[PDB]
Design a binder for this molecule. Structure first.
Ligand SMILES: *[C@@H]1O[C@H](CO)[C@@H](O)[C@H](O)[C@H]1NC(C)=O
Ligand SMILES: *[C@@H]1O[C@H](CO)[C@@H](O)[C@H](O)[C@H]1NC(C)=O
Ligand SMILES: *[C@@H]1O[C@H](CO)[C@@H](O)[C@H](O)[C@H]1NC(C)=O
Ligand SMILES: *[C@@H]1O[C@H](CO)[C@@H](O)[C@H](O)[C@H]1NC(C)=O
Ligand SMILES: *[C@@H]1O[C@H](CO)[C@@H](O)[C@H](O)[C@H]1NC(C)=O
Ligand SMILES: *[C@@H]1O[C@H](CO)[C@@H](O)[C@H](O)[C@H]1NC(C)=O
Ligand SMILES: *[C@@H]1O[C@H](CO)[C@@H](O)[C@H](O)[C@H]1NC(C)=O
Ligand SMILES: *[C@@H]1O[C@H](CO)[C@@H](O)[C@H](O)[C@H]1NC(C)=O
Ligand SMILES: *[C@@H]1O[C@H](CO)[C@@H](O)[C@H](O)[C@H]1NC(C)=O
Lengths: 263, 263, 263
């Protein structure tokens, strides 16, 4: 069960790259296949935090449900949700990652938000979000009506603050700015809180994972230790087989000595 | 030598969780056993930095001495050391981690401190400390008489600055705030300096480790490479045994051909 | 091909420690040998970021060219480039890392710089730079004529901001201050931009690597997974050999039963 992934990255699949037709009735898997140099991976350029840990941790998964965490129509009543660009153009139309919503202001000044979610799925929940990094102060003002903004994310067992870095970057996918991505896991009974006054790429969809019992915490360091441990056991088994055959070879030799003794 | 640890985490054992009766005349070990879902692990909720590296690095230890680094009675002459709470209640009495001291103000305004320690143990020293993160600005003022504080920690080969994040978190162990934990190692001849004007969970006890020669730097990446290297050697050994028996099987066959030739 | 490295660290070799005579016509290698406790490793005390990843990632390299990225004589027309100290004294003369330039002010106030490089080598480029951390505000003013400075580094796929920490550290190599080191990799077609208004240890030389096809991304987690995978294949091979010999031992026994039956 390597999954159906084609010329996509893991990030493209979970973020919702418009070009990855992976939104099918596919549940569990034992390994994830992805293309090292994908075409449908990155949609909008930026750094994906702890990518290696996420792709490693997700290597073994049971039930895999995609569900709404902060529904587009009701979660941000007076925010702009038409956060689209040429970067994610699909069939000629401007767009964005399906599981994310890039929020901007309208009419007046971009208001600040505070939203939360409680995990009642009896599954672990993977929440993805990002941080906007404008190429120029002019856009920081145009989008959020501010020269200063922060994003605060906390949860039962998580504390992080993000700040924007405003600078012109090398042109990538025709963009001068960047969007970085971050993620956390929630256990049943936990809560996540999002507070921001600008530059927030809000979570829309989240993944509820049963995961199963094929791993521990899921940290890549544990997954690798598991493989090594497993190998060590195979080595002891073969060592026993060696002693077994050495003994038998010994006995069979003895008879060769005797059949000879008979003549 | 797996150690005597019961329903405790490594963090609970080294931080001094009141419920972990591990303070006995126990020295060296070859592996640390701990409970994946402990009851006496976390005392006061928060994030433990580089936990995986610390538990991995400590997997092999020689002499293990617990000693005072900054004695409660003399290290902070005009600070409040009665830093206790319900979170660590023991036998009905409010308390805290045994190896840590949560400092607060009194009488006037919480003064700033600057303390240092020089490693003259001829052993490597593990120093644990934490950072307070109030649920509300009201408590930041009540405890340290400030709306702004920082913690600076430097050593021969370490440079880090911590800042508080003030926010209401999901309720964990009846707390709305958090305490994060950080740690460093000192070599013989080194020095550590602690500077703070608030939100410091000061070190009280520290551990002097001889460690031994069963590892290199102790980084988990090296410990795992050591295991792999060790396996590779076992593989070469068994491969030699295979060639040995193949040769002998060949010779024994030859005689089977001849004893047959005799008849 | 372990390389010619003697009593040097990897950092000393790539940073350009005056005492490491490694600047010879040496190209590719299959492993890097270094001294665990070197004399010619550290030149000026400080923390080297992601050292383990860099030494691991460079374990397998093809063509290895050292070239100028920001030539000393033309890249900073009105900056001081005589950034030398006793720490790197060579043959009695004050000096510094050969591949780095420590910039300071002169005449007037230290001006701010903005420099960039585009990778047109058809190779991946390793760029090394550092950040100055004065022991005292007095030196921050004396060197850069400021009480506040920042270093901004961005690239096609990199975003980081550094700030100075001004404090007196434990004396190491006769220094009270520190210089930290950071590094990035550029792919062909990428760009790196350096912006600073003080405390910049500028890049002078950079390394153009062909790397080869003996690894993937080069992250240490992948290099280790490769070794484990390789071992697993060896195990399957030996398991087949075991079945082979067990079958043959069986047949040879049968004849031993019959030669006996003949008598
Ligand atoms: C992936 O790219 C190859 C060409 O390199 C193409 O033939 C194939 O159809 C692509 N697959 C998908 C799912 O786009
Ligand atoms: C905007 O929506 C928030 C709820 O998300 C509400 O509290 C606030 O008063 C609204 N502001 C306006 C101008 O409607
Ligand atoms: C940010 O939140 C404050 C309340 O803490 C509110 O007064 C202010 O108007 C908000 N900012 C914007 C742009 O609405
Ligand atoms: C650990 O928990 C079990 C119950 O799950 C209990 O029987 C045992 O006594 C506990 N051990 C300690 C040291 O508390
Ligand atoms: C508080 O103690 C410090 C030493 O730790 C001392 O320097 C300072 O003067 C004392 N302040 C008062 C009011 O006693
Ligand atoms: C903090 O240190 C300064 C000296 O640098 C001192 O003047 C000030 O009073 C200290 N703060 C408090 C609350 O004592
Ligand atoms: C390394 O140190 C040893 C002494 O421990 C010395 O004999 C040797 O010549 C040194 N090698 C180099 C390259 O300095
Ligand atoms: C210093 O050099 C920069 C170019 O690196 C130039 O733009 C600036 O005008 C120069 N300043 C002076 C005073 O020459
Ligand atoms: C820093 O850059 C600004 C322009 O953005 C310039 O006006 C200022 O003089 C520079 N600082 C110094 C010390 O030259």
């Amino acid at each position: 069960a390597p999954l159906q992934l084609g010329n996509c990255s893991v990030a493209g699949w979970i973020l919702g790259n418009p070009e990855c037709e992976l939104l099918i009735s596919k549940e569990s898997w034992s390994y994830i296949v992805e293309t090292p140099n994908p075409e449908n991976g990155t949609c909008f350029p930026g750094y994906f935090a702890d990518y290696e840990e996420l792709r490693c941790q997700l290597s073994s998964v049971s039930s895999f449900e995609r569900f709404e965490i902060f529904p587009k129509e009701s979660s941000w009543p007076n925010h702009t949700v038409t956060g689209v660009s040429a970067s994610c153009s699909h069939n000629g139309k401007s767009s964005f990652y399906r599981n994310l919503l890039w929020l901007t202001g309208k009419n007046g000044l971009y208001p600040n938000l505070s939203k939360s979610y409680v995990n009642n799925k009896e599954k672990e929940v993977l929440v993805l979000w990002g941080v906007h990094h404008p190429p120029n102060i002019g856009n920081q003002r145009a989008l959020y009506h501010t020269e200063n903004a922060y994003v605060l994310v906390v949860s039962s067992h998580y504390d992080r603050v993000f700040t924007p870095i405003i600078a012109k970057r090398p042109k990538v996918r025709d963009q001068e700015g960047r969007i970085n991505y971050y993620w956390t896991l929630l256990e049943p009974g936990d809560t996540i809180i999002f507070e921001a006054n600008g530059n927030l790429i809000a979570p829309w969809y989240a993944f509820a994972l049963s995961r199963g019992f094929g791993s521990g915490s899921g940290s890549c360091i544990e997954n690798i230790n598991s493989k090594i441990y497993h190998i060590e056991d195979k080595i002891e088994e073969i060592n026993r087989k060696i002693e077994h055959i050495l003994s038998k070879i010994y006995h069979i030799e003895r008879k060769i000595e005797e059949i000879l003794n008979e003549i």
